[PDB]
Amino acid sequence: DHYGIHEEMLQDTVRTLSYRNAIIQNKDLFKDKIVLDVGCGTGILSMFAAKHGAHVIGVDMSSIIEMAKELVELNGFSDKITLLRGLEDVHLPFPVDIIISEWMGYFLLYESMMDTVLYARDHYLVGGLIFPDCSIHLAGLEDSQYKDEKLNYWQDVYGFDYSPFVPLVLHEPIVDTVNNVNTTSDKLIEFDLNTVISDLAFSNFKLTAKRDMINGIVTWFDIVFPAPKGPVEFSTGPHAPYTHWKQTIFYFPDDLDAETGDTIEGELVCSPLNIKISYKFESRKNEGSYLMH
Amino acid sequence: YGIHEEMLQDTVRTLSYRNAIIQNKDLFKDKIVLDVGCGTGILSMFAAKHGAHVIGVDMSSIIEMAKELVELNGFSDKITLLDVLPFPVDIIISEWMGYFLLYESMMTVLYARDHYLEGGLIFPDKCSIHLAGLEDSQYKDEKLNYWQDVYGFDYSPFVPLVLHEPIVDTVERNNVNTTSDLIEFDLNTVISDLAFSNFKLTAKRQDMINGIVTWFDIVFPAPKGPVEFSTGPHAPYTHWKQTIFYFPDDLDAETGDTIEGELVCSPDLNIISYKFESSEGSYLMH
């Protein structure tokens, strides 16, 4: 029952309207069907499905289910929505056609519930649909003025040398909203939720300077929804409208004074999130270790 | 790393601990100090630098950097970092205060006092919780109106969730429109006392009163004949800010009007019955 987290998401109009417009686009396929809402939160996605032709089962392990039952009751969906607190533990009233789920995290796979979505697909899904059914992208960034201040602070802390703290600052990823992207973007990996857990621990990339100082990489993820034959999508990149996911910044140990045409080539390893990235800067070689805790 | 940077950049707090150690530098000489929740160990280094052996105890993986910093700053011979003591202590320094003073507080300090500390000193050794009233009619009205219509759906039942949640934020000084009045704590004599008050507030002008802003004051021990700091909206910024509790109704108050109340605090933190003469609120911190 932390209301800020539910507010943040509902106030993310890009996120919420994407799920709504995807349900409406496929409302013919929602008609007279059984929907499972993984991580229903307040139940907004469940109410969307039920009003547009769907029974919907919402499963969230938070105490917010008590509020969801009250909201579902107040808007006249009590006969079409059954909410259960607790997915590997709950017992569905039905042995499902459509899976709607809001599962994405900051780095897509940081605090994501995709493991639960794959579980729902493998155990409850009939050709069934999966809203949404995603890719991670990255590019170079200029953050020299902000980064230098954060690092300079530790040279003198009330007289004491706090220099060994600097490696901590370089290792922590930064979730923030990034004009300052000065390289081309590359695609790290694709995920098809219909066929993809072992695939999550996983890529090479190549970036070329478009003009600047390069101090790190900004990363985001794209989302695509299923659509009938002949799709609703949205991005969380610095070139797209704001989302509550923002972007994830990884700093370099060294600051590259690059000119146009220079290249940053690398290999990113992601494993349970431990992120090790080896770089090559051609105009040389460096690495970066980051931990999401 | 976020928290530790936030601690050190709170200059009001850190310099308060420093200046308190410096004021009592005569009593720190050649003595043993216990740093409860040493974090990065800056308070341990302060005691050691100004005449103290200091033992820092933190259950976080930070004790490792503390070591590296202590090693780098020449205190390896005076500071030992980290159920756990090399000594069977004269002074307890501790940074233990939380939001509302008690929420997630480390007031472990009483355990160190009762088990490891007679006539020893405790930095700081005195606390107080205060409160007054404020006008946040414009921001509060925004939050609660959002739920009347959420993508067509009636989200009315949610508002109480928003009116019950405490808000940790910095209140501007000009928005306090009543007088200030909750409890004292003496770290030398005070766990059962934490579950605990009556208060009375008078409107200092004609304005809207939408809730109470609460803060806490801190006092350090001093020799005969003390360093202190406040976290109120009238004092310089601290990383604690203030804690706001909303009223269900907004009082359109005139000068001289009174708000009498009783606040009950009991353990997570359950938190107030009001009377507004011109003649309730429950909060949970989780």
From Swiss-Prot, chain B:
Transmembrane segments: none annotated. Changing residue 39 to A: Reduces catalytic activity between 5- to 25-fold. Disulfide bonds: none annotated. Changing residue 39 to R: Abolishes catalytic activity. The keyword S-adenosyl-L-methionine applies. One of its GO terms (molecular function) is protein-arginine omega-N asymmetric methyltransferase activity. PROSITE patterns: SAM_MT_PRMT. Keywords: Methyltransferase, Nucleus, S-adenosyl-L-methionine, Transferase. Present with 37600 molecules/cell in log phase SD medium. PANTHER family: PROTEIN ARGININE N-METHYLTRANSFERASE (PTHR11006), PROTEIN ARGININE N-METHYLTRANSFERASE 3 (PTHR11006:SF53). This is Protein arginine N-methyltransferase 1.
